[PDB]
Amino acid sequence: QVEFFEKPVAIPVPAWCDRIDAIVTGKGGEGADGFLGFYGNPGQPGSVNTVTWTRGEHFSGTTTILEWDGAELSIPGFEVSAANGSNGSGQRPVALGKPVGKGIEEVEYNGLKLAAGGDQHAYGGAGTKPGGGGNGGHWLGIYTQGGPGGPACAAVQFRKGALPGEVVGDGEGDVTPPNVSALHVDVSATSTSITITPSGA
Amino acid sequence: SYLPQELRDELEHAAARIGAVIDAIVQALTGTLNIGHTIEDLIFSLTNIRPGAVGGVLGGGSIEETIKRIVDAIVSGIVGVTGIGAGISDLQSLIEQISSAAA
Amino acid sequence: SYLPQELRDELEHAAARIGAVIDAIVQALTGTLNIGHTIEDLIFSLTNIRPGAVGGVLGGGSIEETIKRIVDAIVSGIVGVTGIGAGISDLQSLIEQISSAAA
Amino acid sequence: SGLRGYNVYRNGVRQNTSPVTELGSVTITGLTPGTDYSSQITVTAIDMAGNESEPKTLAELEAEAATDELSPADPLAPAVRAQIDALVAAKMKPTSGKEADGAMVGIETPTGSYYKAYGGDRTKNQPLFLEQNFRYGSCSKMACNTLLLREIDRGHVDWDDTLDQFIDGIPNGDKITVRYLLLFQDGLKDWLQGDPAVQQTYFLNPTLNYDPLAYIRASTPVFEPGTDSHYSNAATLLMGKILEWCDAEFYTGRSARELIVEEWKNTVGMESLHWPTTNYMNQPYVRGWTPNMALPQIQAILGPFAFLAGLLGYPTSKDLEWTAVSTTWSDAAGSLAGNMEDFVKFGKALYEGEFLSEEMNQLRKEIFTRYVEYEPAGPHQGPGWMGFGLNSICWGHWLGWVGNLGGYIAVLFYNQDDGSVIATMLNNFAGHADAVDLFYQIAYL
């Protein structure tokens, strides 16, 4: 059984439900305003985090409730959230082409899938549900202002039985930064610029 | 005798009426509150027309309201309560869930 | 004294600017790459506006992208794989299959 | 879980716009030369979940993020610089009857070089600076013709080959040979150096888009090929068509827009070189200007002999900005843009005969057809004769071009014997005599 949340709510976990699978999205960033011969930069898409909570290990009995506060998904004793997308900073010259507000991809997890929010191509257009980047502005009329970010959403699955090769997790989502101990960079330069190519994490 | 007064009185404004017609188009199509726009702004306007400037269908005042009513009515019929503020990702999600239950 | 220089230097281009405005409208609305259009070409242009010139909704850059996204999303919910290039014949066919399985 | 990409911060400000990929890149710009930035630049990886590492500073990555030392240009003597500065001042707006708000001059010689910008572009608190881009105009014809001469050196075209081999439906495409394109012996009508209905549209609506190939396919020839030599925009456009055909039959398929910028930008190190696809060019740029002028005065500036003219007319009430223009008005003519240092490098590479064999580089300096005979209006004006070569216009011992597109006049000439380059640039359309006269005065000095 699948539920989609985009406004604050709480619902009871079913009796048959051996485990709960969830995909959670951050809010999008707001796009910047344009000026004259400059567009605004678009906001970035919200991050995507995924969790499986298992009965007995994480929740028990019939008192349980699954609670979405509008930006974090929670049960008694555990919670999962994803980082909000950065706001549009500054401006893009016309010669670099029209800003695009990037959407969240077709993420799939344990046979529950979140529909891809499409990219926003309208000038200053609002970010697409879920979590899409608000598009950058132009400078004429209603196209001047940057768009608001796409709202945060969760997609949740009440499931029965194990899947092929599943092992019960720590009950947190991903809380771990990428391993930078092996991070590598190539650098190149001119008399007035430096070009960075980072790699290897 | 070469250039009559009733012609001279029209030529007094003809050059300015072209600028007024350009400003009138750009304001209607983009919503600027300015004056003295260019034919470059005219081209921008006529290639980026507001969906609020085009008349609607099936009850909509505009084509923006028309499409929003269509998307909202499919999503309201699936979720079973009347609502607003759905997207095309909801449309795909909610039809995928109904198609699965129908199968 | 009858016709000042500041008028005469505007009247110098007034007749050409009307043709430049016609040429600008026809190019924006039909996508021509020509010059010297008529008021007939202008009426054709304004009665056959490209759906690429009208700004879209729900993420679409144009109304052509908006309608294509709506139709492609419904068909992608029914068929399950995300896709493109659906038509209104698919929309009727695939909704008839769900309606039968649901009944 | 999963790497989303990398963010680069300099002094705590994210230089990146959206996450860099595993072998992608970001450019950090406006850095002062010679200085070390290995302590200012810092790098962080992010996960799809939004988790972020504490920054690693480039010193901890052992990366040599120091900017290059400034290149030590060997200067001209100060007595010559004072005279050049007096020559430019005599062309700019504070002098009676001159309309140019600003100028750039780029000189290179065996006895030293001097690059300078002068005046402004009507921005409030910003005089001109040499990092700014400008339109190169019809100096782009030297870039286009040269790649056709390389292609003749490769035997991919012979001199006697005709337009019907490369493109369909051009008037007299059975009788125009490639030699007649290169030497302007094609009889084709010109859409900017002729046709006042086209010219008014260019002046009044420069951001309009145009099909000049369709105009050629409609046109009636002025003369039979080979019977005269007269200035042509149709020629260089049809050289773009021959070069697009070459990239189909040999090489890998490109447009003329792509092939002309790739070769010159990679070979000659012209980092600023581009062909605009938008109405505007890359940042920062010089703004371009024009007086409001009568159609009879626009025809005088856009004509083939225009730089000789006494353009002292049009005491007009007001000026139009002319920064925005569609490159479709000129195509393989007109369309290149970049800055003064790259424009002088283009002149050096045209002197050195880049892209060409030792045999072509001789032939190219010696075959000519008549452009214009004239009577010198003064001592600094040269022989009273100019001629079209296979890739340049000659004026005495100098080879080069004179051009405009919108508000910008640009001149570029190199001395065939000495190897010295003179570039001049005026940001007003009224300046078409003044920039060329300025070139003659620097050459005579």
| Side-chain half-sphere exposure of A165, counting CA atoms within 13 A | 1
- Tell me how far apart the alpha carbons of residues D374 and D87 are, in angstroms, rounded to a whole number: 23
Spatial distance between the Cα atoms of D120 and D102, rounded to a whole number of angstroms: 5
Which one-letter amino acid corresponds to residue A95? A
- D124 backbone φψ class: left, alpha, beta (φ>0; ψ -120 to 50): alpha
CB distance D417 to D443 below 8 Å: no
Angle, helix D140-153 to helix D233-249, in steps of 10 degrees: 40
Q: What's the CA dihedral at A183, A189, A194, A199 to 10 degrees?
A: -20
What is the DSSP code (8-state) at residue D20? B
**CA–CA distance, B27 with A142 (Å, rounded to integer):** 10
Q: Amino acid identity of D388?
A: F
Gap from B92 CA to chain A (nearest CA, Å) = 7
Residues near D224 by beta carbon (within 8 Å), at least 6 away in sequence: D172, D175, D187
| Side-chain half-sphere CA neighbours of D291 within 13 A | 22
Chain breaks in chain B (C to N over 2.5 A) after: none
Distance CA D443, CA D445 (A): 5
> Could you tell me if D316 and D283 are in contact, meaning their C-beta atoms sit under 8 angstroms apart?
no
d(CA D270, CA D250): 25
CA nearest C73 in A: which residue?
A115
Closest chain D residue to B41, measured at CA: D207
Distance CA D226, CA D249 (A): 28
What 8-state DSSP symbol labels residue D251?
A: S
Nearest to D336 by CA among D95, D51, D137: D137
Cα torsion C75, C81, C83, C85: sign:
negative
The residue type at D363? L
**A98 near A44, Cβ under 8 Å?**
no
Question: Which run of H or of E encompasses D398?
Answer: strand D398-405
Asked if B27's CB is within 8 angstroms of A128's CB, the reply is no
Question: D324 to chain C: which residues are within 8 Å by CB?
Answer: none
CB–CB of A114/A25 below 8 Å? yes
Burial profile D144-175: b = 16 or more Cβ within 10 angstroms, e = fewer: bbbbbbbbbeeebbeeebbbeebbeebbbbeb
Instruction: Give the containing element (helix H, strand E) for D249.
Output: helix D233-249
Chain D residues within 8 A of C36 when measuring between CB atoms:
197
Q: Who's near C30: CB < 8 A, 6+ residues apart? A: C44, C45, C48, C50
Over the range D9-36, which residues count as b (16 or more CB within 10 Å of their CB) and which as e?
Answer: bbeeeebbbbebeeeeebebeebeeeee
Strands A91-93 and A73-75: unpaired
D279 chain-B contacts, CB cut-off 8 A:
40
Closest Cα to residue A19, out of A173, A157, A166, A155? Answer: A157
Residue type, D95: T
Q: Is B40 on the interface with D (CB under 8 A)?
A: yes
CA of A61 vs chain B CAs: smallest distance (Å): 28
Residue from A25, A11, A51, A29 nearest A115 by CA = A25
Interchain contact, D317 vs C16, CB within 8 Å: no
D328 has a chain B CB within 8 A of its CB? no
Q: DSSP labels for D286-351?
A: ---EEE---HHHHHHHHSTTGGGS-------S-EEE-----GGGTTTTT--EE-HHHHHHHHHHHH
For residue A30, count other CB atoms closer than 10 A to its CB.
25
Q: Which residue type does A67 have?
A: E
What is the rounded distance in angstroms from the CA atom of residue A79 to the CA atom of residue A76?
A: 8
Which residues from B are below 8 Å from C52, CB to CB? Answer: 47
In DSSP terms, A80 is beta-bridged to: A73
What is d(CA D180, CA D228) in angstroms, rounded to the nearest whole number?
10
Cα–Cα nearest to D352, from D421, D403, D402, D412: D421
Residue A66 corresponds to which amino acid?
L
In 10 A of CB D445, how many CB atoms? 13
Q: Catalogue the E-assigned strands of D2-111.
A: 3-10, 13-14, 26-29, 41-47, 56-57, 102-109
Nearest Cα to Cα of residue A122 among A90, A150, A89, A99 = A99
- CA nearest neighbour of A30 among A146, A152, A153: A146
How is residue C62 annotated by DSSP? S
Q: Which residues pair with B62 in a beta bridge?
A: B55
Q: How many CB atoms lie within 10 A of CB A1?
A: 11
Alpha carbons D236 and D190: distance in angstroms, whole number:
11
Per DSSP, the three-state class of D103 is strand
Give strand pairing partners of D385: D373
On the CB side of A93, CA atoms within 13 Å amount to 11
Contacts of D372-375 with C-beta under 8 Å, sequence gap 24+, read: D372/D304, D372/D305, D372/D308, D374/D308
Task: Please indicate whether, in this complex, the C-beta atoms of C9 and D211 are within 8 angstroms of each other.
Answer: no
- Intra-chain end-to-end CA distance of chain C, in Å: 87
Rg of chain D on CA atoms, in Å: 24
Report how far residue A191's alpha carbon sits from residue D343's, in angstroms, rounded to the nearest whole number: 18
Whole-angstrom distance, CA of residue D288 vs CA of residue D281: 12
For residue A109, what are the β-bridge partners? A112
C-alpha–C-alpha distance, residues A138 and A39, integer Å:
5
DSSP assignment of B58-83, as one string?
A: TT-SBHHHHHHHHHHHHHHHHHSS--
Q: How far apart are the C-alpha atoms of D202 and D233, rounded to whole Å? A: 15
Contact C61 A122 (CB under 8 A): yes
B46 touches chain D (CB under 8 A): no
Residues in contact with D217: Cβ distance below 8 Å, sequence separation at least 6, in sequence order:
D169, D170, D171
CB contact set of D166 (below 8 Å; sequence gap of 6+)? D238, D241, D242, D245
Three-state secondary structure call for residue C63: helix
Distance CA A178, CA A47 (A): 14
Residue type, D194: G
Q: Of the candidates D325, D155, D173, D330, which has an alpha carbon nearest to the alpha carbon of residue D240?
A: D330
Q: Which of A180, A167, A118, A136 minimizes the C-alpha distance to A35?
A: A136
Residue B69 CA to residue B87 CA, distance in Å, equals: 11
| Three-state secondary structure call for residue D234 | helix
Give CA–CA dist D93/A138, Å, rounded: 34
- Cα separation, D193 vs D199, in Å, equals 8
For residues A107 and A52, the answer to whether their CB atoms sit within 8 Å is: no
Q: Is the Cβ of B27 closer than 8 Å to some Cβ of chain A?
A: yes
Q: How far apart are CA A189 and CA A169, in angstroms?
A: 46
| Residues D103, D134 contacting (CB under 8 angstroms) | no
Interface of A with C (CB under 8 A): 103, 106, 115-123, 125, 128, 132
- HSE at residue A195, side-chain half, CA atoms within 13 A, is 7
Query: After which residues do gaps appear in chain C, with C to N over 2.5 Å?
Result: none
What residues of C are in contact with residue D204 (Cβ under 8 Å)? Answer: 13, 16-17, 20
Q: Does C33 touch chain D (CB under 8 A)?
A: yes
Contact D286, D410 (CB under 8 A): no
Contact D176, D162 (CB under 8 A): yes
Chain B CA closest to residue C94: B99
Half-sphere exposure for D241 (CA within 13 Å, toward CB): 21
State the number of CA atoms in the 13 A half-sphere of B16 facing the CB: 7
- Cα separation values, A169 from A39, A60, C33, D337, Å: 45, 16, 62, 58
Enter the resolution in angstroms: 2.8
Residue whose C-alpha is closest to residue D321's, from C18, A36, C29: A36
Q: Which two tokens stand for residue A149?
A: 């970010």
Tokens, residue D77: 């003597």
Question: What Å distances lie between residue D412 and A81, D59, D181, D400, D440, CA to CA?
Answer: 61, 45, 21, 5, 11
Contacts of D205 in chain B (CB under 8 A): 39
Q: How many angstroms separate the CA atoms of D326 and D331, rounded? A: 9
Q: How many residues does chain D have?
A: 445
CA dihedral angle for residue C10, residue C16, residue C20, residue C21, rounded to 10 degrees: 60
Tokens of C77: 């919910």
d(CA D390, CA D147): 11
Q: How far is C36 from chain B (nearest CA, A)?
A: 16
β-strands A193-199, D369-373 pairing: unpaired
Asked whether the beta carbons of residue D205 and residue C34 sit closer than 8 angstroms, the reply is no
CA distance B12 to chain C (A): 7
- Give the count of alpha carbons within 13 A of A87, CB side only: 7
Nearest CA in chain C to D296: C12
Angle at D303 between CA C19 and CA D390, to 5 degrees: 125
Within A133-200, strands assigned E span: 154-159, 184-189, 193-199
Q: Does residue B94 sit at the A interface (CB-CB below 8 Å)?
A: yes
Q: How far is B68 from chain C (nearest CA, A)?
A: 8
Q: Can you point out the beta strands (E) in D127-206?
A: 134-135
Long-range contacts, stretch D196-199, CB < 8 angstroms, 24+ apart: D196/D295, D196/D299, D197/C35, D197/C36, D198/C35, D199/D295, D199/D298, D199/D299, D199/D302
What is the Cα–Cα distance from D435 to A93, expressed in whole angstroms?
29
Question: Could you tell me the two tokens for C91?
Answer: 């929309």
Task: Name the phi and psi angles at D397, rounded to 5.
Answer: -80, 10
For testing the chain C interface, which of B18, B40, B45 should be mutated: the one with the most C CBs within 10 Å? B18
Residue D130, chain A, CB below 8 Å: the answer is no
| 8 Å CB contact of B45 and A155 | no
Work out whether the CA dihedral D142, D148, D151, D153 comes out positive or negative: negative
Q: What is the C-alpha separation between B93 and B74, in angstroms, rounded?
A: 12
- Shortest Cα–Cα distance, A3 to chain C (Å): 16
Measure the CA angle with vertex C11, ends C9 and C16; round to 5°.
115
Eight-state DSSP code of residue D73: -
Least CB–CB distance from B31: residue in A118, A129, A141: A141
CA distance D274 to D258: 9
Q: Facing residues of A55 across strands? A: A59
Angle at D58 between CA D52 and CA D63, to 5 degrees: 135
Per the CB < 8 A criterion, the answer to whether A50 and D1 are in contact is yes
Query: How far apart are alpha carbons C61 and C54 in whole angstroms?
Result: 9
Q: Which two tokens stand for residue D17?
A: 């716009």
> What is the token pair recorded at D311?
């353009």
**CB distance from B81 to chain A under 8 Å?**
no
Q: Which of A186, A176, A184 is nearest to A200 (CA)?
A: A184
First to last CA, chain D: 69
Q: Which chains lie within 8 Å of chain C at 3 or more CB pairs, if any?
A: A, B, D
Phi, psi of C75 (to 5 degrees): -65, -35
Residue A45 has a CB neighbour count (10 Å cut-off) of: 32
Measured between CB atoms, which of C9, C20, C36 is closest to D204?
Answer: C20
User: Comparing C-alpha atoms, which of D67, D76, D437, D388 is closest to residue D235?
Assistant: D388
